[PDB]
Amino acid sequence: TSVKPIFSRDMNEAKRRVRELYRAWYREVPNTVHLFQLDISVKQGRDKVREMFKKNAHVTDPRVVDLLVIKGKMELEETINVWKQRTHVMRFFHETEAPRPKDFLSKFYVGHDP
Amino acid sequence: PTVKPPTARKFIWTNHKFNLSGTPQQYVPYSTTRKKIQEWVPPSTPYK
Amino acid sequence: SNLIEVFVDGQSVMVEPGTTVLQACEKVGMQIPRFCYHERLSVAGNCRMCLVEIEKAPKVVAACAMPVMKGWNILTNSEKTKKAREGVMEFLLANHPLDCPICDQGGECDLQDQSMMFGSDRSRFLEGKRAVEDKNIGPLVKTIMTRCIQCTRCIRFASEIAGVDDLGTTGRGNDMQVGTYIEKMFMSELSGNIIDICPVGALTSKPYAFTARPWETRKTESIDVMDAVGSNIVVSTRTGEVMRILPRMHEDINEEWISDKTRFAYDGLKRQRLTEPMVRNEKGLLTHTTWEDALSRVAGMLQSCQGNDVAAIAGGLVDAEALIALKDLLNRVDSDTLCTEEVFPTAGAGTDLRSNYLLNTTIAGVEEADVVLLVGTNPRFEAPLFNARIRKSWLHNDLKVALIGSPVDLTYRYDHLGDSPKILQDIASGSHPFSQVLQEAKKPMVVLGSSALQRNDGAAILAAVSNIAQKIRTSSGVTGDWKVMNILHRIASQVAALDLGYKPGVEAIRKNPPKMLFLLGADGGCVTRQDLPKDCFIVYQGHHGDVGAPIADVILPGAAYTEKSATYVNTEGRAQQTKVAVMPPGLAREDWKIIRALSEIAGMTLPYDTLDQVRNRLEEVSPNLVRYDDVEGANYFQQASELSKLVNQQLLADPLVPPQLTIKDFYMTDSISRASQTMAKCVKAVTE
Amino acid sequence: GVRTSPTGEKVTHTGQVYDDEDYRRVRFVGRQKEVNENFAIDLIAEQPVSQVGSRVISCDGGGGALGHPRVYINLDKETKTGTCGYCGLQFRQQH
Amino acid sequence: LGLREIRIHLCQRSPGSQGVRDFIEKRYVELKKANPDLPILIRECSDVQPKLWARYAFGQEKNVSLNNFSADQVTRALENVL
Amino acid sequence: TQLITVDEKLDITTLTGVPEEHIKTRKARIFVPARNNMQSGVNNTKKWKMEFDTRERWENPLMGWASTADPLSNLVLTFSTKEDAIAFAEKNGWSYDVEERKVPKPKSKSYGANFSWNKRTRVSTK
Amino acid sequence: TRPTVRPRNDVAHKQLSAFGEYVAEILPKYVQQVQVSCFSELEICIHPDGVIPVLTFLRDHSNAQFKSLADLTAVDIPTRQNRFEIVYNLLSLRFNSRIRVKTYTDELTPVESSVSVYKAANWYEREIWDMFGVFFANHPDLRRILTDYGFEGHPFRKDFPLSGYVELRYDDEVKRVVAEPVELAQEFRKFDLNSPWEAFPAYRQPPE
Ligand code: SF4
Ligand code: SF4
Ligand code: FES
Ligand SMILES: [Zn+2]
Structure with a gap:
């Protein structure tokens, strides 16, 4: 099963590229929140960014992690340019609840949700 | 159209009710459909 | 070659x-x-x-x-x-x-x-x-x-x-x-x-x-109800609703075939359904209300009561998932009594022993039978697709079919033997030329109807039929594994409730009076408020209740068979899951969802929340019910019949007649078929 | 030409009149529910049943190739007058 | 508290399950005469680990695996349950 | 050229941006569509249709339409083998159910079987 | 078949047959199928490692000029281990002929950036990356064109549904445009239309 790679040799170089990407996102926040005339503190946005990094935490193939690094690189280039607008950055946040919980009783009052 | 106007069918108006959006007399949409599922009738008598 | x-x-x-x-x-x-x-x-x-x-x-x-x-x-x-x-x-x-x-x-x-x-x-x-x-x-x-x-x-x-x-x-x-x-x-x-x-x-x-018009409607996989056979049914649904149904093909059963009641039965499924939970009011009026007041009242009463006063009768078309959830909450609280509308005897270990309480053979495999007799039933009006299979067998290859109990209009020139259990056991056992056809035939089948199961002598007639099957089983060296013996049923949830270890028949309520009970689809008058103490507290969880529902204290709007992913068993033991096609009108949530929500509100819990975990506990209780679409052939028939000699009682000479005998009794025996005015039109058409 | 609700509203040719526990009534408030005044069932019974003393007849419906296609209907039952599925207007044989 | 229900999980081919088939040939009518009050039950699906479970004491379920065991050991496990 | 490759399964739901709610919530169904029995034509076989479960469809209060908040409601995926069907259902992360294909059983018919001498198979009407 | 039937040029059939046999015999390393359609356009079905060599060959070599580039498309076909189809289309100025280079590809293993031999393939590659996800290594600029930047999911897959997961509206609460989950006011009534009865017996695939 000789399958071509993308960039790396195992998950270790993938961890190196994603921690470089996380460093770039971490020092890329304050210019964005200063520029876009936003509404949310710096640490809250940084916490949701690192939460997004925590979200995909069970991926083991090197090609998929490399491709997520490429996706984050594309999105970081677009945010460090002013190509995106206020709507997109607020669209990364989810403030428009929908507070729909996993409570089975609350799943029962508004239901049909297996 | 005074050469031959008419038609010999008895449903055609003679008022010709003109455009009326922004009046107290204007069209509304609704459903031309009767009862959907016919909810259960509870009986009126008591058991004690 | x-x-x-x-x-x-x-x-x-x-x-x-x-x-x-x-x-x-x-x-x-x-x-x-x-x-x-x-x-x-x-x-x-x-x-x-x-x-x-x-x-x-x-x-x-x-x-x-x-x-x-x-x-x-x-x-x-x-x-x-x-x-x-x-x-x-x-x-x-x-x-x-x-x-x-x-x-x-x-x-x-x-x-x-x-x-x-x-x-x-x-x-x-x-x-x-x-x-x-x-x-x-x-x-x-x-x-x-x-x-x-x-x-x-x-x-x-x-x-x-x-x-x-x-x-x-x-x-x-x-x-x-x-x-x-x-x-x-x-x-x-x-x-x-x-x-x-x-x-x-x-x-x-x-x-x-x-x-x-056929191009708008979408097709949906489903399983038949109201019969113990379960023809494969495709619902032509349209717009969050229905339009009609169609039969579709299973190889073992019901190839391009469906019942006419089944075909025209969707009207009463959509006619006068229940929408909301309903609580009685001190004027005496069953008002309707939100889930909060109803579930709070039910949970407070259930927490305030224990003993042998917790009864549950599940009849008609109910799930296996809801039965597992109700049984689990039932054994969370203290103890049991569970009954169905119909009665099955427990003498030779009938609740267990997969042999006796279902059709042992293959429904497609009745084509290879040689001599078949038929103790009281009417297969024209009890799963008519089985009668069509019988006639197809008799048309293609050879049969010799006798009927015991009442000469009915089975349309294929059948033998009739008379009406007494003593006649069947003595004639088929001792000396008779038709009994000689039984002893010196090759592949025989005795079909026991569920119609003659209703009398008190059902243990005795069951013992006699097992004696006939045991005598042919010891006779002729044929074929094992194969068997003369099979029985039939009327409701699939009866077979599921026999599988899940319940008590068939209302006898546990007849002896021990309860004081709190749950009716899951009890259509007929098995119990009333006169066979029971005055303070009843019954909770009917159902749909389009018209007989049984005005009796009730607490109405819960259960789902229907087109409205929930069930897991049903045919008369020969095949697990066939349904597929959800229509979401129910009204509030009307799912049944196991209601029972696990009741366990959530009352002072207990259950270690399962989703239907996959319900399937896990169903896998815990019975392993065959999750392995779908397949047959299951058990054994130990001589062991069952030697268990049957514990109770050996009278075979009374009352002439056993199937009440499933005429067209109106076919068309009106369900709440669903009872509700639909299509069935009322054809009832008055056939009678008048 | 029409009938009227107990609340005092124009019903339609389809029986879709309302409760007193609704809200489509409250979107009908102040704005006229424009029902069709002339119904459809009423015009048919006013028509004279066209009688031809043939056996099997044709129908076009108001001009050749302007209307429903040709339908050949039977007039062999006598108490059951044959109705075109398109025209709606009945026929009788004569003898 | 007391016993409520006993469940049997079997197949057609496994050596311990074959031991349970021998146990259920020889010592089930004896087991049924022992208690006509306990609803024990027997199940096969197509092939499964031949389990023996028992639910009692407000829903507490207990497992024994009767894989690669003989019939007298199954009798011993039945005595362990009952 | 005998490069890096690991031998693992695929978890493409990290790539296709789909909500995890609609991943873990729904459950696919893989089946051969049964013949629409009012017609008699078996060309509608020879496929493997993947659908999803049907879900909530209320009514539009203003018109009487059918509205739904279900984005994966009206898909169908036509496949040609059950092997790659189950492979794809594993590959794109969602759970799945597998029904089984049921063939028309071959038979034995003849006009001479319809016109026997002593056998009760007799059409009696044609 | 003398009226109302489109005639076909069997001269071009034989010429494209001979040319396809020529190309297939002279590059045995990557050529897997050469098929001639009944309506006479040449199709060459290609392993995804001779992308750069075969395109350097087809742009040049002077027996086949083929400067003009048409589409690059990707058609999403499941039930295949290699799903997607990168379809180059080439047109010769001097010769008036069209060849469809159908090279295959999977979900993840890339192909190799035809912009180094074909400048017109640049934005085609950017578009096919944004809409499908066929990765294009050794390429300068892979960004998003024909989507929103807050949008993702590669919506031209068959796996992505018709209506997208997001839906915009305006609200005065946060004084801006927000993106909610999809709430259709009408069903998009899908029509089962494929009748049975085998409209083309020549294209009967064999059974199992
Ligand atoms: S002969 Fe019978 S089945 Fe055939 S078209 Fe006429 S009514 Fe229909
Ligand atoms: S659809 Fe078929 S049966 Fe109906 S009118 Fe047309 S040809 Fe006749
Ligand atoms: S099938 Fe109609 S004649 Fe042969
Ligand atoms: Zn007409």
Whole structure:
């Protein structure tokens, strides 16, 4: 099963590229929140960014992690340019609840949700 | 159209009710459909 | 040896002898445009669309009746084959009216599809087009005989699988009215199957008649209810709702077959359903309210009560998932009593022992039986598809079928033995020539109905039938594994409740009085508020309750079989899950969702929240119920019958008669079929 | 030409009149529910049943190729007058 | 508290399950005569680990695996349950 | 060229941006569509249709339509083998159910069987 | 078939047959199928490692000029281990002929950036990356064109549904445009339309 790679040799170089990407996102926040005339503190946005990094935490193939690094690189280039607008950055946040919980009783009052 | 106007069918108006959006007399949409599922009738008598 | 060569379009293949051209073409992947052939009926070479050119032949032969001789070369797509098909299609579209908008088979015609993909396009026949006066075959089947192309398919249908013989050809030439001369209502069981047999829009549905069109509706997988057989049913649903149902094919059971009550049974499913939970009011009036007040009242009462006062009767069409959830909450609180509407005896360990309480054989495997007797029931009005299978067996190969209890209108020249259990045991045991046919036959089958199960002597009659099966089991060395013995049922949830370890019959409530009980679909009067103390607190969780629901204290709006992913068992032990097609009107949540929410609110919990975890606990309780779509053959019949000698009581000489005996008793025995005015129309039609 | 609700509203030719526990009534407030005044069932019974003393007849419906296609209906039952599925207007034979 | 229900999980081919088939040939009518009050039950699906479970004491379920065991050991496990 | 490759399964739901709610919530169904029995044509076989479960469809209060908040409601995926069907259902992360294909059973018919001498198989009408 | 039937050029049939046999015999390393359609356009079905060599060959070599680039498309076909189809289309100025280079590809293993031999393939590659996800290594600029930047999911897959997961509206609460989950006011009534009965017997695939 000789399958071509993308960039790396195992998950270790993938961890190196994603921690470089996380460093770039971490020092890329304050210019964005200063520029876009936003509404949310710096640490809250940084916490949701690192939460997004925590979200995909069970991926083991090197090609998929490399491709997520490429996706984050594309999105970081677009945010460090002013190509995106206020709507997109607020669209990364989810403030428009929908507070729909996993409570089975609350799943029962508004239901049909297996 | 005074050469031959008419038609010999008895449903055609003679008022010709003109455009009326922004009046107290204007069209509304609704459903031309009767009862959907016919909810259960509870009986009126008591058991004690 | 048993192989004959054909060059279907120059492609060689081996074919079994005796078969014909069309089966070989379906063996190689071809079709042939056909009308009067059908894969469940006799072959009658009438349609003429099925033609095909064989080389070295001046004529063009029909591909239905021609036997496969050695070494053919079949030209399915030759020149004069296509010429003949264009000709015969141009003949068929002369006497057929222009009803393509108003017809009922717009996307589902056969003339239209074959006239595109094989017919001509420019027509002829400037003047003519005869017209035929329609009949009124019955208030369930709309009938316009002008669209009839005289393809002679319903006639063979009736004369074989219905046996009724009310539809015949009248006339000659162009004038051949196909129908009944005497204007009699063609009414029997499986009469609903004739509107799908009719390959054109001539014999069609009456309640569906001008309500939909096939391309808008979407198909949905489902499993039949109201019968212990479970024909495979596809619901043509439309717009969060329905339109109608259709049968579809399982190999073991119900190949292109459905009950007529089943076919026309969706009206009462949509007629007067329950919508919201309902709580009584101190005026005495069952008002409706939100889930909060109702579930709080139920949870407070259930937490404030224990003992042997917790009863649950589950009858009619209920899940297995809801039964698992109710049983689990039931054993969370303290203890048990659970009953169904119907009664099964527990003497020779009948609740366990997979042998006795279901149909042991294969329903397709009854074709290989030789001598069958039938102790009290009526299979024409208890799972009529099984009766159609019996008649199909008797028509193809040899049978000898006797009936014990009442001479009914089974339509296939049956033997009748009389009405006493002493007659059946003594005649079939000691000395009788029909009993000699039993002893010196090869593959016999005794079918026990659930109708004679209702009396108190059911343990004794069960013991007698097990004695007959045990005597033939010790006789003749045949065949093991195979068996004379099988029984039938009426409700699938009865079989599921027998599987999950419940008490059949209301006897545990008859002895021990409860003080809190849950009715899951108790239609009939098993228990009332007079066979029970005055402070009842019954909770009816159901749908379109009209008998049983005004009795109730707390109404819960349960779901329906088209509204939840069930897991049902046939009469021979096959787990068939349903698929959700319609979301229910009203609040009306799922049943196991209601029970696990009740466990959430009352002071307990359950270690499962989703239907996959419900399937995990169902896998805990019974392993076969999650392994779908498959048969399960148990053993230990002699062990069951030697367990049966614990209780050996009287076989009273009352003449046992099946109450399943007439047309109204077929049509009205459910809340669903009782509600639908379609069934009321055909009840007053058949009676008056 | 029409009938009227107990609340005092124009009903339609289809029986879709309302409760007193609704809200489509409150979107009908102040704005006229424009029902069709002339119904459809009423015009048919006013028509004279066209009687031809033939056996099997044709129908076009108001001009050749302007209307429903040709339908050939039967007149062999006598108490059951043959109705065109398109026209709606009945026929009787004569003898 | 007391016993409520006993469940048996079997197949057609496994050596311990074959031991349970021998146990259920020889010592089930004896087991049923022992208690006509306990609803023990026997199940097969097509093939499964031949389990023996017992639910009692307000829903507490207990497992024994009767894989690769003989019939007298199954009798011993039945005595362990009852 | 005998490069890096690991031998693991695929978890493409990290790439296709789909909500995890609609991943873990729904459950696919893989089946051969049964023939629409009012017609008689078996060309509608020879496929492997993947659908999803049907879900909530209320009514538009203003018109009487059918509205739904279900984005994966009206898909169908036509496949040609059950092997790659189940492979794809594993590959794109969602759970799945597998029904099984049921063939038309071959039979034994003849016009001569319809016209026997002593056997009760007799059409008696044609 | 003398009226109303489109005639076909059997001269071009034989010429494209001979040319396809020529190319297939002279590059045995990557050529897997050469098929001639009945309506006479050449199709060459290609392993995804001779992308750059075969395109350097087809742009040049002077027996086949083929400067003009048409579409690059990707057609999403499941039930295949290699799903997607990168379809180059080439047109010769001097010769008036069209060849469809159908090279295959999977979900993840890339192909190799035809912009180094074909400048017109640049934005085609950017578009096919944004809409499908066929990765394009050794390429300068892979960004998003024909989507929103807050949008993702590669919506031209068959796996992505018709209506997208997001839906915009305006609200005065946060004084801006927000993106909610999809709430259709009408069903998009899907029509089962594929009738049976085998409209083309020449294209009968064999059974199992
Ligand atoms: S009524 Fe229908 S099935 Fe019967 S002969 Fe006519 S077309 Fe055939
Ligand atoms: S049966 Fe077929 S051909 Fe006849 S009117 Fe109906 S759709 Fe048309
Ligand atoms: S099937 Fe051969 S004649 Fe109709
Ligand atoms: Zn007319």
